[PDB]
């Protein structure tokens, strides 16, 4: 039987009842606002007093602006205390990714029977970094590379970064500024500008975009935006897939003619949808994340196409102490054109690399270029002779990836404890086992005209590899190292068994 | 969009219920009032011996509901008046 | 420490003796040459066959933070060549820096520096030049810097 | 920078108003 000093909550306590139930009762009352109930047991519960929160203060925020932490709380000052109104605040801070640890505490107000002090403690993480360097010699000249990226710029909450490079063959730069909080209610605003002039064929492009978004629920948010890209191409090497597109656009390049040009002006509309219930920024143990984005063209553009990309992952713990965890990952996407227009090749999907599929060379998975028989000053000993009139008299096969219109990648990763625990590694290094596989294939591939060549429309040629990976959030930023051994490969494929990259994505 | 974007519920002030408000009577001491209702959250910073109990809630995509209770005391700490405003004008 | 060896191939037969620290030997066929090596901290690497050349060197210590190491090698088609490396290490209460340079006659020369800061600053560079060869590098430099916030 | 800080000056009340009682802290004595 159950009895107690309850404020009428007999139905709720009966529902709870129908050895640990005493704590579920404590949680129920904490939701109502009793900070220190007493339960004895044939159980008698003394609800106690109602409590109010006197003030909220933070310690350890030496770099971040105070507004950054207060905006993430749900419990307001001058209101009754609730357990649900603080614990979510604790989870909320972890999702920013700006802290090493998050602690919570409840203190009594001296001399005040019904008031408490709510205190949060954080340790700020070193997360940003700036790099530059040069390369110079009389043989090639001097090249420059520099840029900066930070998630939190001087503690103001703004996500910014500037990158670019200049060398003898290409000019590239981008600038991005995003404000995660434009209004007090969580409305976001940001965008970017870029320039990409690649002189090597000739490939010159530039453009900008602006994106708006806002939350719609506690775990869901929406995004939308606009942008513009300029594309001017010239002297492209004739290819079957490339000319299919050109014919779709109404172009008629001369047969095997290296002297050509093409430019387009494409206006697009951006949108997306996200879900995020993860309990950590760097190393999560629970929840799942879904990121669905895409773009469509609008009237007045030269190209007519759409693109949808899905990126999601799920973490499920095995051990009660979250030392054994299993991670699933999958990526999906699809695109096409409208009105008879093919999707432009510069938006094609690529797969492979240390980031997307381990053990394969970056962007080497997928259909390969098929070159037509011209002449050049590189024919004697420097050019791809089968692309000229002398090296070949028919269509030449190659291993040159062109990208596709559809892809699918998935992997299963088994996350385990490290070989040992140390103060510098206990919460900074994690190791795991994985199984990676995926596939990229084309559409509108006319296998009836080209029979002696591979059929790129058959999605069943699945690429697969496996290996071991090491993650480290080093003082110089995230780093991931891994080794994998491919098992299933097809003619034209390339592999890299030892790969690493920056641990960002 | 103004009515679409999610907003968290905001609570302000002390909790009140009719079951407890009806228990206050003129002649009670400050200790009896604080015991029955709890510690006041607002007072007159400029010296008036009065306590303010304000219950205000503003749910998302909802209007504002509130009740204002003003308690006045004499120099002896004895409650002199009960100002009950069940709703905002 | 010593003994004879022989090997055969699918009618050709090659024989020789391995005899010993400086180790020497010879080889003949049934098509001849000599070889030797040593592991002291000095080393010897001698190869002579009916192409010739030899490399030898030793790491010398000058200071507790500096060293000199000759590693000269000769190549015969005689092409003169030699290589002697030097270096020094630096440290402090909150830092350590290593600088490196060298010269190898053909003549290749290079310099570089590696600095290690307390937590978020990494810097280094390299420069290459050469002289008196049939080809030469006049001046080339590479450098990088990283600063983390 | 600290040498450029503006001077402090106590606020006064209009007749009929009582100011909050100064807390027992952050008291700076008059010095030369």
């Amino acid at each position: 039987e159950v009895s107690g000093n309850l404020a009428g909550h007999s139905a709720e306590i009966e529902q709870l009842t129908k050895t640990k139930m005493e704590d579920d009762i404590k949680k129920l009352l904490g939701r109502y606002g009793y900070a220190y109930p007493r339960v004895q047991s044939r159980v008698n519960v003394d609800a106690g007093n109602r409590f109010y929160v006197r003030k909220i203060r933070f310690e350890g925020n030496d770099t971040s602006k105070d507004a950054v932490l207060r905006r993430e709380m749900r419990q307001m000052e001058g209101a009754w205390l609730g357990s649900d109104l603080v614990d979510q605040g604790k989870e909320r801070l972890n999702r920013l990714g700006f802290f090493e640890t998050v602690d919570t505490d409840t203190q009594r107000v001296p001399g005040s029977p019904d008031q408490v002090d709510v205190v949060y403690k954080v340790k700020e993480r070193n997360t940003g970094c700036f790099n530059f360097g040069i390369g110079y010699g009389t043989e090639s000249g001097v090249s420059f590379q520099a840029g900066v990226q930070q998630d939190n710029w001087l503690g103001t909450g703004y996500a910014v970064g500037i990158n670019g490079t200049k060398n003898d063959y290409q000019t590239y730069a981008e600038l991005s500024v995003t404000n995660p909080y434009f209004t007090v209610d969580g409305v976001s605003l940001g965008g970017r500008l870029f320039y990409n002039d690649f002189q090597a064929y000739t490939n010159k492009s530039y453009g900008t975009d602006v994106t708006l978004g806002f939350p719609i629920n506690e775990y869901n948010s929406l995004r939308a935006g606009l942008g513009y890209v300029h594309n001017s191409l010239s002297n492209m090497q004739p290819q079957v897939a490339m000319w299919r597109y050109l014919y779709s656009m109404g172009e008629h390049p001369s047969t095997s003619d290296q002297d050509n040009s093409f430019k387009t002006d494409d206006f697009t509309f951006n949108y997306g949808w996200t879900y995020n219930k993860l309990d950590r920024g760097y190393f999560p143990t629970d929840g799942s994340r879904v990121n669905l984005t895409g773009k469509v063209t609008i009237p007045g553009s030269d190209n007519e196409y759409y693109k949808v990309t899905l990126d999601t992952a799920t973490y499920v713990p095995i051990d009660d102490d979250h030392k054994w965890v299993v991670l699933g990952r999958t990526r999906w996407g699809y695109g096409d054109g409208l009105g008879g227009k093919e999707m432009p090749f510069y938006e094609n999907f690529y797969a492979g690399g240390s980031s997307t599929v381990r053990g394969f060379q970056s962007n080497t998975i997928g259909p390969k270029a098929v070159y037509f028989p011209q002449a050049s000053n590189y024919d004697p000993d420097y050019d791809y002779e089968c692309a000229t009139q002398d090296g070949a008299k028919d269509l030449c096969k190659s291993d040159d990836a062109v990208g596709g219109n559809a892809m699918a990648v998935a992997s299963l990763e088994f996350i385990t404890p490290t070989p040992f625990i140390s103060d510098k590694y206990a919460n900074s290094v994690r190791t795991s086992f994985f199984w990676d596989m995926g596939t990229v294939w084309d559409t509108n591939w006319d296998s009836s005209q080209y029979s002696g060549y591979p059929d790129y429309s058959d999605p069943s040629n699945i690429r697969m590899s496996a290996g071991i990976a090491l993650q480290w959030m080093s003082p110089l930023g995230p780093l991931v190292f891994s080794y994998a051994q491919p098992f299933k490969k097809y003619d034209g494929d390339k592999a890299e068994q030892f790969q690493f990259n920056i641990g960002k994505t | 969009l103004e009515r679409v974007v999610y907003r968290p519920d905001i609570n302000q002030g002390n909790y009140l219920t009719a079951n407890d408000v009806s228990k206050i009577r003129v002649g009670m001491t400050q200790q009896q009032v604080a015991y029955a209702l709890g510690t006041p959250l607002m007072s007159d910073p400029f010296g008036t011996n009065t306590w303010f109990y304000v219950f205000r809630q503003q749910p998302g995509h909802e209007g504002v509901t509130q009740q204002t209770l003003t308690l006045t005391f004499n120099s002896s700490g004895v409650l002199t008046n009960i100002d009950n405003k069940p709703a905002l004008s | 420490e010593a003994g004879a060896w022989a090997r055969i191939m699918s009618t050709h037969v090659q024989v020789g003796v391995d005899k010993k620290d400086l180790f020497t030997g010879f080889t003949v066929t049934h098509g001849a040459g000599l070889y030797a090596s040593a592991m002291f901290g000095a080393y010897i690497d001698l190869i002579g066959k009916y192409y010739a050349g030899a490399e030898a060197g030793y790491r010398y210590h000058v200071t507790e933070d500096a060293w000199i190491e000759p590693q000269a090698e000769l190549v015969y088609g005689l092409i003169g060549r030699t290589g002697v490396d030097v270096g020094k290490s630096f440290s402090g209460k909150d830092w350590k820096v290593t600088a490196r340079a060298g010269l190898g006659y053909q003549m290749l020369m290079s310099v570089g520096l590696n600095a290690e800061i307390r937590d978020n600053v990494r810097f280094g560079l390299e420069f290459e030049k050469s002289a008196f060869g049939k080809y030469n590098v006049d001046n080339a430099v590479n450098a990088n810097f990283r600063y983390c916030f | 920078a600290y040498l450029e800080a503006a001077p402090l000056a106590e606020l006064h009340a209009p007749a009929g108003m009582i100011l909050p009682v100064t807390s027992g802290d952050y008291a700076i004595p008059v010095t030369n």
Partner: protein
């Protein structure tokens, strides 16, 4: 001498050398100024207002300078500076809550400023915040009192 000698001299006075090289974790072995822990070269260069950062170090510095006063001529002005810097923190918090709408927090937060920093500029600038907060409700007498204190000053 030179700070370069002071570094060499570290092989063997220690507090000065730690200060000169900003060895702030080592200067605490003396247990006078810990103000260096409230700033950053990057924040300084760009002119970032540090009023919204953690004030606990400033509070400790205030306590130690008070103990020393209870060099004095400059320490007094430093105490005035730190007191004003502390008042700015409360001001910023009050503005945040005003924007969010937690008017009850605004009223209690400002009242605290009135009790603790009655002589700083931050308090005079904060005063208009209470009138607004009172005008979101029907607590007109407090708004009248605030208007009267504002008009006098």
């Amino acid at each position: 001498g030179n700070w370069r000698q002071a570094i060499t001299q570290l092989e063997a006075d220690l507090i000065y050398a730690y200060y000169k090289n900003a060895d702030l974790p080592l200067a605490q072995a003396a247990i006078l100024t810990n103000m260096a822990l409230d700033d950053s070269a990057l924040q300084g260069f760009f002119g970032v207002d540090r009023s919204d950062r953690d004030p606990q170090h400033a509070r400790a510095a205030f306590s130690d300078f008070s103990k020393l006063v209870r060099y004095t001529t400059d320490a007094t002005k430093r105490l005035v500076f730190l007191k004003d810097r502390l008042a700015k923190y409360e001001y910023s918090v009050a503005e945040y809550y005003t924007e969010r709408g937690a008017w009850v927090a605004v009223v209690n937060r400002v009242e605290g400023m009135l009790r603790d920093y009655p002589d700083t500029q931050a308090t005079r600038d904060a005063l208009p915040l209470m009138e607004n907060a009172y005008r979101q409700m029907q607590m007109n007498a407090q708004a009248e009192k605030v208007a009267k204190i504002i008009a006098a000053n």
